[PDB]
């Protein structure tokens, strides 16, 4: 089963899904006239020519069956200014990311930024920027963009977040990308002993973060189905699968497995202690600008009795502001949030019809 969860953030149509296709082969199906709409999914095996992508070195130098380092998984988000609410959601599963900028369009493009700051906000600090469409540019253009990038990546937290220009269309230079992602996006340790806890983002599906599940365990889903109240659903793990291959157990990094109902639900040990809140204590901070749209208008402070999207974990819930202090507001929710720990959250506002990421904080119990 895949070790780790790498996210592919970035603006729309810069080709995020396409880069995922040059690396794994997989498409996200697509959406077929539009573009990626659900989080796409794909896995792959990374071995190395001591002396790669498939146990085969005789592609460069020679034969000695490349040594297997790990098997990774991706999460293709969409790129469209409005799928913001899912991409947020998705990050909750990531162990790291790769920012696909387009080589032939104006560097800080709305969503590119929106994402980037979301990344530095939630905690995904293991980042690799990638200059994509260099197969359609002047040898000057792609370097000057590398400049604007090397300059943005300055004051910000992004010291030596390297920048590997690619060609997702002709799959060129991807191997140096595999070397980046084999250096910088290291595979985090996870204590298993911990409480078995996992996030859901499809169902016909989700990612583990702490603990480990096994075939035939007794389990529950939170908040679960509703009545207006919200009760937990119990069942037995009928089966465990990663990619197309079945396993008997499942551990963090990866995604495991009608329409996608229990979206934003979480799965834990049956008979486990987790709060199904209706009202929550957020500590919090704001951006000074609204980085996302294609206008940077300065963030108005929170007024109470305002409706805001509270993105918690994979879930996406809506809620109203009952309390407004310096960095501690109290929120009343439509759909309950099962708070498994202490936690991270992301806070948005309907600025001009479309919602927009404006600030963050920490859930508090």
């Amino acid at each position: 089963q895949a070790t780790i969860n790498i996210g592919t953030i970035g603006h729309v149509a810069h080709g995020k899904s396409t880069v995922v296709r040059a690396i794994s082969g997989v498409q996200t199906v697509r959406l077929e006239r539009n573009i990626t709409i659900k989080l796409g999914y794909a896995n792959a095996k990374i071995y190395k020519c001591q002396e790669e992508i498939s146990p085969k070195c005789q592609r460069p130098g020679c034969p000695g069956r490349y040594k297997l380092v790990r098997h990774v998984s991706f999460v293709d988000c969409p790129g469209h200014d409005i799928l913001m609410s899912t991409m947020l959601s998705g990050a909750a599963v990531m162990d790291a990311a790769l920012l696909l900028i387009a080589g032939n369009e104006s560097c800080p493009q709305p969503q590119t930024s929106e994402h980037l700051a979301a990344i530095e906000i939630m905690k995904l600090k293991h980042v690799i920027i990638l200059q994509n469409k260099v197969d359609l540019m002047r040898e000057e253009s792609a370097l000057e963009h590398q400049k604007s990038i090397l300059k943005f990546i300055r004051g910000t937290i992004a010291d030596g977040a390297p920048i590997v220009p690619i060609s997702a269309q002709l799959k060129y230079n991807i191997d140096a990308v595999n070397e980046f992602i084999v250096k910088t996006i290291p595979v985090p340790p996870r204590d298993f002993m911990i409480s078995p806890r996992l996030i859901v983002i499809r169902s016909f599906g989700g990612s583990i973060l702490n603990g480990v599940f096994k075939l035939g365990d007794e389990i529950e889903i939170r908040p679960g189905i509703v009545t207006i109240q919200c009760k937990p659903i119990f069942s037995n793990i009928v089966s465990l699968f990663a990619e197309q291959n079945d396993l008997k157990f499942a551990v963090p990094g990866g995604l495991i497995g009608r329409a996608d109902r229990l979206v934003g639900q979480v799965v834990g040990a049956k008979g486990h202690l987790p709060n199904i809140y209706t009202d929550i204590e957020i500590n919090y901070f704001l951006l000074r600008r609204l980085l996302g749209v294609k206008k940077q208008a300065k963030v108005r402070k929170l007024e109470p009795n305002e409706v805001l999207m509270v993105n918690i974990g994979s879930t996406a819930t809506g809620a109203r502001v009952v309390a407004v202090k310096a960095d501690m507001a109290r929120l009343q929710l439509t759909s309950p949030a099962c708070t498994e720990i202490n936690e991270k959250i992301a806070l948005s506002r309907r600025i001009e019809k479309h919602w927009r990421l404006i600030g963050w904080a920490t859930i508090k119990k």
Partner: peptide, 17 residues
């Protein structure tokens, strides 16, 4: 650090059609 990169840019360009 540009050298590493400038390098990378080189190596892709030399792989075109």
């Amino acid at each position: 650090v540009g050298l590493p990169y400038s390098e990378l840019l080189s190596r892709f360009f030399n792989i075109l059609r």
